[PDB]
Enzyme design. Sequence first.
Site, PDB file in Angstrom:
ATOM      1  N   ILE C  39       0.867  -1.170   0.000  1.00 21.15           N
ATOM      2  CA  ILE C  39       0.000   0.000   0.000  1.00 21.15           C
ATOM      3  C   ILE C  39       0.905   1.221   0.000  1.00 21.15           C
ATOM      4  O   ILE C  39       1.571   1.507   1.004  1.00 21.15           O
ATOM      5  CB  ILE C  39      -0.948   0.016   1.206  1.00 21.15           C
ATOM      6  CG1 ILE C  39      -1.910  -1.167   1.149  1.00 21.15           C
ATOM      7  CG2 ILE C  39      -1.720   1.313   1.259  1.00 21.15           C
ATOM      8  CD1 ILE C  39      -2.837  -1.244   2.336  1.00 21.15           C
ATOM      9  N   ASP C  40       0.934   1.943  -1.115  1.00 20.21           N
ATOM     10  CA  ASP C  40       1.833   3.077  -1.250  1.00 20.21           C
ATOM     11  C   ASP C  40       1.418   4.204  -0.308  1.00 20.21           C
ATOM     12  O   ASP C  40       0.412   4.129   0.401  1.00 20.21           O
ATOM     13  CB  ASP C  40       1.862   3.562  -2.695  1.00 20.21           C
ATOM     14  CG  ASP C  40       0.487   3.625  -3.310  1.00 20.21           C
ATOM     15  OD1 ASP C  40      -0.431   2.983  -2.766  1.00 20.21           O
ATOM     16  OD2 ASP C  40       0.321   4.319  -4.333  1.00 20.21           O
ATOM     17  N   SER C  41       2.213   5.271  -0.307  1.00 24.29           N
ATOM     18  CA  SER C  41       1.968   6.386   0.596  1.00 24.29           C
ATOM     19  C   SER C  41       0.769   7.223   0.182  1.00 24.29           C
ATOM     20  O   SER C  41       0.254   7.988   1.002  1.00 24.29           O
ATOM     21  CB  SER C  41       3.213   7.264   0.679  1.00 24.29           C
ATOM     22  OG  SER C  41       3.545   7.767  -0.599  1.00 24.29           O
TER      23      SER C  41
END
Lengths: 253, 33, 83, 245, 34
Positions: C39-41
């Site tokens: 889950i990216d930023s």
Amino acid sequence: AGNQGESLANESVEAVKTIVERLAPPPGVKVYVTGSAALVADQQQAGDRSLQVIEAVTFTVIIVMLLLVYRSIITSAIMLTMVVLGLLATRGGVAFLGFHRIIGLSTFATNLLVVLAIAAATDYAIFLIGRYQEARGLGQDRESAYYTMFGGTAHVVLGSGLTIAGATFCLSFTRLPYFQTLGVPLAIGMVIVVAAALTLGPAIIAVTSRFGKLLEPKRMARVRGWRKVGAAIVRWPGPILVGAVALALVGLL
Amino acid sequence: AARPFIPRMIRTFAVPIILGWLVTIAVLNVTVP
Amino acid sequence: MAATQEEIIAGLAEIIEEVTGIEPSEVTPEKSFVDDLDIDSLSMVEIAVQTEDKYGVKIPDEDLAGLRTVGDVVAYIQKLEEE
Amino acid sequence: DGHAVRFIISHEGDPMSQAGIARIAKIKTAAKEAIKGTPLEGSAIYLGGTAAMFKDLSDGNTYDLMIAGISALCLIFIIMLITTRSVVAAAVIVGTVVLSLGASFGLSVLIWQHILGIELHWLVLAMAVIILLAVGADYNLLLVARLKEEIHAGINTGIIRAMGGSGSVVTAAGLVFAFTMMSFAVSELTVMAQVGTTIGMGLLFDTLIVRSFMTPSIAALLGKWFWWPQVVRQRPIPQPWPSPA
Amino acid sequence: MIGTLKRAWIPLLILVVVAIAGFTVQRIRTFFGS
Ligand SMILES: CCCCCCCCCCCCCCCCCC(=O)OC[C@H](COP(=O)([O-])OCC(O)COP(=O)([O-])OC[C@@H](COC(=O)CCCCCCCCCCCCCCCCC)OC(=O)CCCCCCCCCCCCCCCCC)OC(=O)CCCCCCCCCCCCCCCCC
Ligand SMILES: CCCCCCCCCCCCCCCCCC(=O)OC[C@H](COP(=O)([O-])OCC(O)COP(=O)([O-])OC[C@@H](COC(=O)CCCCCCCCCCCCCCCCC)OC(=O)CCCCCCCCCCCCCCCCC)OC(=O)CCCCCCCCCCCCCCCCC
Ligand SMILES: CCCCCCCCCCCCCCCCCC(=O)O[C@@H](COC(=O)CCCCCCCCCCCCCCC)COP(=O)(O)OCCN
Ligand SMILES: CCCCCCCCCCCCCCCCCC(=O)O[C@@H](COC(=O)CCCCCCCCCCCCCCC)COP(=O)(O)OCCN
Ligand SMILES: *P(=O)(O)OCC(C)(C)[C@H](O)C(=O)NCCC(=O)NCCS
């Protein structure tokens, strides 16, 4: 004998060209037929020779763009049938009401009506199919997705199309015949495009959806990227608005 | 019938609508220039 | 004022599902957003936005970067609830 | 019958430039001042030709553009007011439409006039504003209807969902039509190429900047004031954390 | 009376906008030719 803009002017210009270049000139001399009435004739006779190439290039681009949007041949074909049928109905209806002298046409209103009809038809077909496929990607079956598509998009299509049909009917109040002649035919073409997009479109979707996996979505990970864009917008709206306005100022200056 | 009337009718009569639009386009495109 | 760890994970996993697609069966208190869940930023930002919209739990930007595991988010929410 | 005399006048440079069109009033004034104080005073003066026709067309074009713009902007405001029961949303959409149209035509003026050196034909502006207003109405209505139907879960979550759902669709549509209009650059006729590329650049900028970031950003700044006459919540009443599974 | 005017405020605003725009348009329609 004509009147710059009408067809009698081109009648006369080509007749004069015939009379002039019918008999050979003396050796060492050439004869030409210029003026801002032979220029208008040559322009209006080369415009429709370049538009026959444009009519092919635009469709060659439409097909590629459709294959890029929907990574599928059958979906692109279905949408292209929607658009082509809407455009054909629009052209037929306007040419009918102009041929029977019911409305007053022009060879400029036609070239603008083709563009506006293609734009509106493509927009409405993309709206309908995209809403249907988005409802399909959330899990809804084909019937529920059809009804979600309709309930979500049909009133938008109707309102936007009627707004365009009114806006390009208020051109009838302008004074230049260029714009004045755009009013009635563009409004009627918009009405036809909207009726097509709101009846034939949903009907084509309701028929094709019940066979195999015709209109089933493929590009659902684009929704996630656009959700991340929306997240960035709602988290830091001020900086993003500043950037967008700075970009718009480049053109506005 | 818990579905709205307009989409329900467009869905029930889907093929007559398609064919009707087809003959409309055909007439409008072959009976005039 | 004592929303349990299971309850917080249950409410958080159905936002993680809508944001990413990861089933709530995978959202366990020891998984890393970057490494395990991937889950990216920028998806964490909308996880936080929807958490604030749904349960009123506000997580600022400077504190959102220091929440590496799901357990860190649960602990943050519990410590914020304790006041 | 000898009651009228005519003079055949030629220009020095281009008759159909801005100077050759400004010369028409000067010719008429000179002819009127030459007969002042003579037995021919009070005679009627008629001036025809190509630069006179184009002077008349130049005067009429700006008034026709103003009429069409007023009518279209009022229709757009009315449809945005009917769809979203909001004065602020309608006014913001009209303002973004005007700003996007201006920025797009400015970018086209840049590309064509300043970089390529070719000025824009006098019909490009009208033919561009028509199509741009129409497609902008389409795309803005589709975005704000989804916004209105999804802000019930919170204005921020509503904007996120509306982006993920309808921003994809409006972007696909805008890109398709923009790239089919920018295909006019292959024409020998420079006016068709100019119209096509102006509409295409206008839709590119519009769908990738204005409708993609500026309109939802304004909807996010003005949280509940975007729908002002309607009383909406920034977010719902907080829910308790659900029971497991 | 405010209770009933703030119920039909949308048709009233639409009527005001249409009136202003129509008068301004019929005014501009007289600038050409003269
Ligand atoms: C004969 C010649 C004729 C000529 C014409 C013929 C040519 C024909 C061929 C044409 C080729 C073009 C083909 C187009 C492809 C069609 C794509 C499509 O269908 O749309 C859906 C398409 C789906 O993509 P996908 O491939 O299916 O995959 C989905 C993702 O991979 C999902 O993966 P993910 O989840 O991992 O994350 C990626 C996610 C994105 O995830 C994120 O990264 C989130 C980012 C959040 C942003 C945070 C900061 C925000 C900053 C705010 C500041 C405001 C301004 C910011 C500008 C953008 C900065 C990023 O991507 C998205 O899905 C959404 C992207 C959002 C796009 C918004 C950016 C807009 C760009 C604006 C700049 C362009 C200038 C316009 C002015 C033009 C002037 C004329 O949506 C997009 O992703 C957008 C891509 C293409 C959109 C346009 C971009 C360029 C295209 C051509 C424009 C040319 C302009 C060049 C001008 C040069 C400048 C000098
Ligand atoms: C060719 C012409 C053809 C016609 C042209 C087009 C015709 C239509 C025009 C379009 C009209 C735009 C619609 C705007 C209506 C929005 C107002 C509203 O009702 O919402 C309430 C909203 C109240 O929300 P709030 O203050 O956040 O409430 C507090 C919260 O409850 C709790 O507070 P908090 O704790 O959250 O604190 C944070 C809060 C701060 O809380 C506060 O307490 C702030 C309160 C102080 C601000 C108010 C001071 C305003 C004093 C100046 C008034 C200027 C009005 C100009 C005339 C109207 C605009 C035309 O932060 C904010 O929300 C403020 C940011 C909101 C503004 C951001 C920009 C949105 C406005 C849309 C324009 C986008 C700008 C693009 C730039 C364009 C560049 C060319 O009103 C505002 O305070 C926002 C100010 C809006 C600035 C408007 C500037 C527009 C610039 C364009 C003007 C161009 C006109 C040129 C005409 C031609 C000349 C040649
Ligand atoms: C030149 C002639 C034209 C001049 C026209 C002048 C300008 C007229 C402006 C037209 C305004 C039309 C407004 C209609 C849409 C307004 C949007 C709206 O009111 O929002 C509601 C829309 O409510 C409506 O449904 C309005 C009714 C529209 C239904 C669309 C049915 C389309 C009919 C199909 C056949 C089309 C044939 C028409 C041929 C023109 C919200 O409803 P909802 O979100 O709860 O969901 C709706 C669906 N469950
Ligand atoms: C390019 C063409 C654009 C032309 C358009 C011009 C724009 C002018 C905008 C004028 C704004 C007038 C809006 C009238 C206010 C309507 C609010 C109201 O009366 O009722 C609300 C009640 O809310 C209130 O109590 C607020 C009362 C204060 C209203 C005071 C009017 C403010 C006038 C603003 C002046 C701005 C003028 C700008 C001129 C350039 C909501 O009632 P409802 O929920 O029952 O109806 C919604 C369902 N359909
Ligand atoms: P991630 O490691 O890719 O970080 C992404 C984010 C976007 C969270 C970024 O680093 C950040 O934290 N703050 C930047 C704020 C911002 O993006 N503003 C809008 C762009 S103008």
